[PDB]
Amino acid sequence: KRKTGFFFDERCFWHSTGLHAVTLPVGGWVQPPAGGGHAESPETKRRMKNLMDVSGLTPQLALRSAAPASLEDLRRIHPDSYLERFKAISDNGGGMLGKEAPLGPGSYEIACLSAGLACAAVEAVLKGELDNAYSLSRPPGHHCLPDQSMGFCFLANIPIAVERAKAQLGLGKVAIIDWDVHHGNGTQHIYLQRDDVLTISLHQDGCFPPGYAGEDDRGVGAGEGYNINIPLLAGAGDDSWRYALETIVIPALARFEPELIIIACGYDANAMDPLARMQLHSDSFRAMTEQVQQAADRLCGGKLVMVHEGGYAESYVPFCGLAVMEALSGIRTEVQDPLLEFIQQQQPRATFAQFQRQAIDRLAQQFGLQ
Amino acid sequence: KRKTGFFFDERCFWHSTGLHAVTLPVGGWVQPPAGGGHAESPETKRRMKNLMDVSGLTPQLALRSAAPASLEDLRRIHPDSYLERFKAISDNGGGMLGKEAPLGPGSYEIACLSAGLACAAVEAVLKGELDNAYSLSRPPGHHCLPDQSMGFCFLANIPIAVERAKAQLGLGKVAIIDWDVHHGNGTQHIYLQRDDVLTISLHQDGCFPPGYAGEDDRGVGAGEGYNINIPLLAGAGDDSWRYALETIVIPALARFEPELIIIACGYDANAMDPLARMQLHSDSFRAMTEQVQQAADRLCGGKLVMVHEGGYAESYVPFCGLAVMEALSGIRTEVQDPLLEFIQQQQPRATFAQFQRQAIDRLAQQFGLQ
Amino acid sequence: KRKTGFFFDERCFWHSTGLHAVTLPVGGWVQPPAGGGHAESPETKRRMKNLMDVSGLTPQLALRSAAPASLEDLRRIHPDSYLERFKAISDNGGGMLGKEAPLGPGSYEIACLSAGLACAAVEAVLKGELDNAYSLSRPPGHHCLPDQSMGFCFLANIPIAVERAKAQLGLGKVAIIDWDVHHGNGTQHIYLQRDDVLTISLHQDGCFPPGYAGEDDRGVGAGEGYNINIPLLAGAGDDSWRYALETIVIPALARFEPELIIIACGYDANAMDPLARMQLHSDSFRAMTEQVQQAADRLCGGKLVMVHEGGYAESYVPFCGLAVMEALSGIRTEVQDPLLEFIQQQQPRATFAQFQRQAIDRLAQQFGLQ
Amino acid sequence: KRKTGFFFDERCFWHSTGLHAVTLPVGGWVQPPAGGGHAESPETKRRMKNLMDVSGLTPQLALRSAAPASLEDLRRIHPDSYLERFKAISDNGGGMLGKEAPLGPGSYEIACLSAGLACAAVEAVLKGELDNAYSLSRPPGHHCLPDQSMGFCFLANIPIAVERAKAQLGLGKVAIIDWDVHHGNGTQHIYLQRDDVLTISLHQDGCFPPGYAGEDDRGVGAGEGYNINIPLLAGAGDDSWRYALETIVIPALARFEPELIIIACGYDANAMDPLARMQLHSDSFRAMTEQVQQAADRLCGGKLVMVHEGGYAESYVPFCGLAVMEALSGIRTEVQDPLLEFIQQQQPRATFAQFQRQAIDRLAQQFGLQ
Ligand SMILES: [K+]
Ligand SMILES: [K+]
Ligand SMILES: [K+]
Ligand SMILES: [K+]
Ligand SMILES: [K+]
Ligand SMILES: [K+]
Ligand SMILES: [K+]
Ligand SMILES: [K+]
Ligand SMILES: [K+]
Ligand SMILES: [K+]
Ligand SMILES: [K+]
Ligand SMILES: [K+]
Ligand SMILES: [Zn+2]
Ligand SMILES: [Zn+2]
Ligand SMILES: [Zn+2]
Ligand SMILES: [Zn+2]
């Protein structure tokens, strides 16, 4: 039983992005949705917190909100031209911030709050106030480029908190493991030429950004060797993701020797997600958390911070997030994941599992870890 | 430009199945859904018809409803013990018809209507009134066992229409191709010992029924060799599904020589579906329809009937169904699928594509077609 | 049994107006809605048509769509400055057309189609092709001022069709009876100085526009005496509305002697509506339709056109609209309104009923009809 | 600034009641709803709490949950025959508990929790731990008869807490003021023959139970004179409700001299509610709370407990509940009710206001208070 922080704020559920039919904007041949719909609905994140409450887990955590990330915090990552336009659209009722980047009224302040939850979670663990922490950051961060919103992300949540910790708290080497099912292209770009931040992405081959695999992009200049892309095959499930972690991610952590491990923790690799094609269940996320926590215990005194990213299965993500918080806190509630046994039966058979293992083996060899 | 029937009835959208959070029943650890949700929502089927209307396709089709399947029709497939319990629950306001089989008030009559749309679509094509036909049958049929509801299905839609056509219209050999992403276990079971109906299922390996692949189940007795299961790898997309059709399904059709080809046409292999993990787009469904229509032209005077099964991506299924109706009617509207290019970029790379091709090749060899 | 036209088009259900929590725009202290919500949802209008289908009424009507109102049609009512801005916002993806006037992508074309359904319904009845007609016009029209959108209305549906009929079909005197629960301020303004169009509004005192009663606004110049406002007391129900019709509206019709009677037919006086406080049920709307149809038989050869306006009780409006179409067509289906008896019991007692009767009596005397 | 308790539990939002189209059950002529809908959705209560959080009010309150009401607690009000059937249906997955009484899985435990929140709120104020308290009890209580569920209510929340306080805490005279817009028939029945509990209901004449006004039902036996029904006219607004309070309710409180004042606090008199026809706004509820709090200060040392009942305007109830909590706590947030000015303009004009005042005057005279 560890002292585990949970950083969240009701306001993060109020960020809106206009009318969508799942991911499609309304208009032309896309009929308006009759009820809910839009993928980045707050309901997925809210239902996770709701389940944490009814399970009795919440009162055993250190609950916190946070001051929003300041303008100085944002400027470590994003140029003023981007921030001023983001704020302008937000200030004027919402609208488009470039193609496929809809935001709502006050989304600017809410995005800053989301980034601040990450900032505070990182600071608390580094100072030793908490053993580990989870930040329920909405909107997400890991696709956000310095000057371009992408994939529902408007600020670079994890990079903002990292650069803050580097300027204010003397943070050294840090590893960012991104197991959101989509490529962490924002994190990758920001740290591409830097050897002080090790960026690792496990992602469905070609999912988002579309067509990007990226195993050959290892970083540039001083950063060469300090970026790792693991494009897993669409359809992969529990065995494949855990194999990738233990075979590539953990050995990379051991070679890098970080002061802190941050997870870009998306759940959209879950077996019901509409936005990707992987077959993970709640125990998959439970095991992956155990793997990185134990690495944290060996490498940086257990210092581990997880920042929420994606996840779009409204009824199933809550069980995956509870599993992560149970593993992170070391507290097991009475909740049994009602789809666990079902998804276990759906797992790829041994021919696929071994084919995927081969491919992970080649990646490990390509990255100098085998 | 063919004379294409479209069989549908507003009442089929009124069948309900109680409260669900996507697929999970409400209760215990499953929070009630705040808005829409439940997977077998009518909205997916309605949005397809709506798009057919606004695209201008609908008036160029032969629109029809149908008389419901009669009690005699149902009795060719289902025993009275099952039918009487189904009707009893339906008559008393809805409820459970065995584990995981929720139905609503009047679901019995609506299920009979759904089966009747299939009955009529088959009869019209056989009589030469239409060149081909599509039946928007809701609730679906292909998981329904004679005495057990499964997978949202309460009557065996396609088998009921087939046995009707065999008793009333002298129908001989027929092939049923099931490209709903889940295994057509209901069709398979009903015809397992029969050589007059060739049953073929393309399905995600192990998806539903969970854990079932089934390549080795070829039929029994006189039916041995007349059932074909193609368990494709989760994650497979456009290349893999079309390869399976041309490599296994078409050659099997040519050897069997049917009088009629019926498609169990589900769309849940689409790249956004929450209930499976395949990567098909609208052109995938367009090409598969072309493949089976051209087979129909060579083998049974173009006689082709498609019966709607699954499909749970509420914004994307409509574009897939429009594509099928465009291919089936030979009429192309102005509608461009707004996600086509996106999903094309997400397709598995050549290593997976070739691995899956190998596996299809082994299946073809196992089935005596190579 | 009359030849009754029903003018509708699926596209009218696709007009959207952004994100709303019932009537409130999202932002500030207004949390985004978790599911459906926004008042001018298409679902109310769609559920009426759906019920018409399942009841068996639809095939006994003359179903039609219409060519959209042309730019010349719109210019009889609206100045180019307003139309060009409306089209500009619509053409650029939707947005605000002045304060509290949100519209969506393509709303311009859909509004023109809505107005065209009214245009065609009026033309068919005038030419004697139909005995009477109903136009399911969405978006609504009766609050639209020449140069200002108001109350969900972006074009003046009924005035556009009237002026079209006056220029193309030699239409003379016409009476417009508006029993939408809100004041028909758009119709009133357009015809304020004209004696060739008699405009009558029954509306909840002060509801919308807010604070407007209007009994003393009788028209201006040549139009003085040709506008009639009946501000009924919030809470009034079946007795009060029918009394107002027979006591003020019918006698006014008899004195004016119209060539055509058009109903601005809103249902938001229904006993469940969130946007007003009246207690009407389906038989109330059935009786009001009978009253105006019989007036039409006496005054203008039965020529009666009804144009859909408001109505925001998603489960109850469909029964009210069916009732109107049953009365209009002279066809009674098997449908019994499941809330009729309930709402009948909720009706104001005799003290209120008589107080409201007194007030109607004073209005009748004020208008020279008693 | 008072010490104000707020009793709530996430589990109360999980009680479900099956599929409804607003208030209508699905089936027959009632089409299933496409999105949200059903009137007793948790969203109304949740959005109030959400707004309390984002406004900054919540941390200034004493937040509490409660132990559920025990079986002994329930038995002070309800017979075992009713409780055992309620629990049986709840234990078996939900279903009907008599006509028009749908409940869901585990609704029994959740109803007990709802009643326990009321029990605890009453106990805390009586013991002097809090100055006043609000209980966010869902499901509601005030229509529940001892042996019959009615109007969304399955246990008699306020009577259960009262009888508990009378047996365990020596509670004497108590007054229950019910300003939910519907008649508190459950409270009335339970205390009909008792002079130790004064029951007062302000309600829309004839709304629910339908057709019931009840001014002449004053209580029976020893209870005669200790029940007060104020059937206000549908359509009444701010002036009328406040006049009734000051003219009938406050003088009745002063004559009775209670030890405690409990409000059955429903918000469905709000000007947007689908289930009644009154025109109250947030300041109306703010003023009514002030009136009863000041009475509490004069009569029973400020001891005031409010228990949540109805309220079905999903976007507007939250502003009314915030207003009540602001008045109750003596803390004003920055939130301005965005519809206040609008609803103020909709208020009945002076003719109605004076007519309603007359009727209240007669009631006051009938009850011996003028
Ligand atoms: K995405
Ligand atoms: K790097
Ligand atoms: K990733
Ligand atoms: K299924
Ligand atoms: K067979
Ligand atoms: K299949
Ligand atoms: K309005
Ligand atoms: K006029
Ligand atoms: K009106
Ligand atoms: K009620
Ligand atoms: K009493
Ligand atoms: K009341
Ligand atoms: Zn993602
Ligand atoms: Zn399927
Ligand atoms: Zn209206
Ligand atoms: Zn109520």
What one-character DSSP code corresponds to residue B69?
A: P
Torsion of CA B18, B19, B21, B24, to 10 degrees: -60
Taken in order C83, C89, C92, C94, the sign of the CA dihedral is negative
Q: Does A359 touch chain B (CB under 8 A)?
A: yes
* Neighboring chain D residues of B32 at a CB cutoff of 8 Å: 14, 16, 42, 104
Which residue type, as a one-letter code, is found at position A365? Q
> Which one of A8, A9, A10 would you mutate to disrupt binding with D, by most D Cβ within 10 Å of its Cβ?
A10
Q: Which CATH architecture has domain C4-16+40-366?
A: 3-Layer(aba) Sandwich (3.40)
- Asked if residue C332 lies in contact with residue C263, where contact means CB atoms within 8 angstroms, the answer is no
Expressed in angstroms and rounded, the spacing between residue B151 Cα and the centre of ligand 4 is 4
Residue B262 backbone dihedrals phi, psi, to 5 degrees: -115, 130
| Cβ–Cβ below 8 Å for A206 and B347 | yes
What one-character DSSP code corresponds to residue D96?
A: E
Q: What are the sequence ranges of the domains in chain A?
A: 4-19+35-366
3-state secondary structure of B168: helix
Q: Evaluate the omega torsion of the peptide bond into residue A33 and state whether it is cis, within 30 degrees of 0.
A: no
| Cβ–Cβ below 8 Å for A10 and D50 | yes
Question: Which residue in C has a C-alpha nearest to residue B58's C-alpha?
Answer: C10
Helix (H) or strand (E) holding C171: none
Ligand nearest to the CA of D273: 16
Q: Does B166 touch chain C (CB under 8 A)?
A: no
Q: Does C366 touch chain D (CB under 8 A)?
A: no
- For tokens 């049958």, name the residue: B137
CA A16 to chain centre: 19
- C-alpha to C-alpha distance for D201 and D212, rounded to whole angstroms: 12
- Asked if residue C139 lies in contact with residue C153, where contact means CB atoms within 8 angstroms, the answer is yes
Among C31, C271, C315, the residue with its CB nearest the CB of D50 is C31
- Asked if residue C105 lies in contact with residue C94, where contact means CB atoms within 8 angstroms, the answer is yes
Count Cα neighbours of D359 within 13 Å in the Cβ-side half-sphere: 23
CA distance A343 to chain B (A): 8
> Which one of D50, D65, D113, D314 would you mutate to disrupt binding with A, by most A Cβ within 10 Å of its Cβ?
D50
CA distance B105 to chain A (A): 22
- Asked if residue D146 lies in contact with residue D320, where contact means CB atoms within 8 angstroms, the answer is no
Q: Tell me if C180 is assigned to a ligand binding site.
A: yes
| Cβ–Cβ below 8 Å for C36 and D31 | no
Q: Does C29 touch chain A (CB under 8 A)?
A: no
Among C34, C50, C236, the residue with its CB nearest the CB of D31 is C50
* Neighboring chain C residues of D24 at a CB cutoff of 8 Å: 315-316, 338-339
CA distance A239 to chain B (A): 14
SS3 sequence of chain A = CCCEEEECCHHHHHCCCCCEECCEECECCECCCCCCCCCCCCHHHHHHHHHHHHCCCHHHCEEECCCCCCHHHHHCCCCHHHHHHHHHHHHCCCEECCCCCEECCCHHHHHHHHHHHHHHHHHHHHCCCCCEEEECCCCCCCCCECCECECCECCCHHHHHHHHHHHHCCCCCEEEEECCCCCCHHHHHHCCCCCCEEEEEEEECCCCCCCCCCCCCCCCHHHCCCEEEEEECCCCEHHHHHHHHHHHHHHHHHHHCCCEEEEEECCCCECCCCCCCCEECHHHHHHHHHHHHHHHHHHCCCCEEEEECCCCCCCCHHHHHHHHHHHHHCCCCCCCCCCHHHHHHHCCCHHHHHHHHHHHHHHHHHCCCC
- Asked if residue D28 lies in contact with residue D140, where contact means CB atoms within 8 angstroms, the answer is no
Alpha helices in chain B (DSSP H): 43-54, 71-75, 80-91, 107-126, 157-168, 185-190, 238-244, 250-256, 282-299, 317-329, 340-346, 350-366
* Neighboring chain D residues of A50 at a CB cutoff of 8 Å: 10, 13
**Strand C20-21, strand C24-25: pairing:** antiparallel
E strands, C129-271, are 132-135, 174-178, 197-204, 227-232, 260-265
Question: Which residue in A has a C-alpha nearest to residue C109's C-alpha?
Answer: A28
CA distance D30 to chain A (A): 17
| Cβ–Cβ below 8 Å for C32 and A104 | yes
Q: Which CATH code for domain D4-19+35-366?
A: 3.40.800.20
Write the CA distances from C212 to C217, C223, C269, D79, integer angstroms.
10, 20, 17, 53
- Asked if residue D18 lies in contact with residue B32, where contact means CB atoms within 8 angstroms, the answer is no
Torsion of CA C25, C28, C29, C32, to 10 degrees: 50
Write the CA distances from C94 to A103, A119, A295, C51, D105, integer angstroms.
14, 37, 51, 31, 44
What one-character DSSP code corresponds to residue B70?
A: P
* Neighboring chain C residues of B13 at a CB cutoff of 8 Å: 50
- Asked if residue D270 lies in contact with residue D313, where contact means CB atoms within 8 angstroms, the answer is yes
Which residue type, as a one-letter code, is found at position A337? D
Strand partners, A20: A25
3-state secondary structure of B50: helix
Q: Does B42 touch chain D (CB under 8 A)?
A: yes
Q: Is B282 exposed, middle or buried (0-12, 13-18, 19+ CB in 10 A)?
A: buried
Expressed in angstroms and rounded, the spacing between residue A362 Cα and the centre of ligand 7 is 64
CA distance C19 to chain A (A): 6
- Asked if residue D193 lies in contact with residue D218, where contact means CB atoms within 8 angstroms, the answer is no
Expressed in angstroms and rounded, the spacing between residue C211 Cα and the centre of ligand 15 is 15
Q: Tell me if B361 is assigned to a ligand binding site.
A: no
- Count of pairs with CB atoms under 8 A, one residue in C, one in D: 157
Q: Does D28 touch chain C (CB under 8 A)?
A: yes
What's the length of chain D?
370
- Furthest C-alpha separation in chain D: 55
What one-character DSSP code corresponds to residue B248?
A: I
3-state secondary structure of D202: strand
| Structure tokens that stand for B219 in this block | 């039929």
- C-alpha to C-alpha distance for D363 and D201, rounded to whole angstroms: 13
CA distance B9 to chain C (A): 9
Q: Which CATH code for domain B4-17+35-366?
A: 3.40.800.20
Q: Evaluate the omega torsion of the peptide bond into residue D209 and state whether it is cis, within 30 degrees of 0.
A: yes
| Cβ–Cβ below 8 Å for A34 and D36 | no
Q: Which of residues 247-276 of B touch A (CB under 8 A)?
A: 271-275
> Which one of D22, D53, D314 would you mutate to disrupt binding with A, by most A Cβ within 10 Å of its Cβ?
D53
Active site residues of D: 143
What one-character DSSP code corresponds to residue C144?
A: -
Write the CA distances from C339 to C270, C315, D22, integer angstroms.
11, 10, 12
- Asked if residue D55 lies in contact with residue D337, where contact means CB atoms within 8 angstroms, the answer is no
Among A14, A35, A54, the residue with its CB nearest the CB of D11 is A54
Write the CA distances from C188 to B283, C158, C352, integer angstroms.
53, 11, 29
- Asked if residue C282 lies in contact with residue C289, where contact means CB atoms within 8 angstroms, the answer is no
> Which one of A48, A54, A315 would you mutate to disrupt binding with D, by most D Cβ within 10 Å of its Cβ?
A54
- C-alpha triplet B235, B237, B238: angle, nearest 5°: 175
What one-character DSSP code corresponds to residue C355?
A: H
- C-alpha to C-alpha distance for D252 and A182, rounded to whole angstroms: 66
Strand partners, C20: C25
**Strand A95-96, strand A174-178: pairing:** unpaired
- C-alpha to C-alpha distance for A311 and C195, rounded to whole angstroms: 63
Torsion of CA D253, D255, D259, D263, to 10 degrees: -10
Kindly give, in sequence order, each residue whose CB lies less than 8 Å from that of residue A275, ignoring residues fewer than 6 positions away: A23, A39, A181, A182, A207, A208, A268, A310, A312, B272
Q: Which of C15, C20, C38, C143 is catalytic?
A: C143
| Structure tokens that stand for A201 in this block | 């992405």
- Cβ neighbours around C190 below 10 Å, total: 25
Q: Which residues of D are annotated as a binding site for Zn(2+)?
A: 180, 182, 268
Question: Which residue in B has a C-alpha nearest to residue A333's C-alpha?
Answer: B29
* Neighboring chain A residues of C18 at a CB cutoff of 8 Å: 18-19
Q: Method used for this model?
A: X-ray
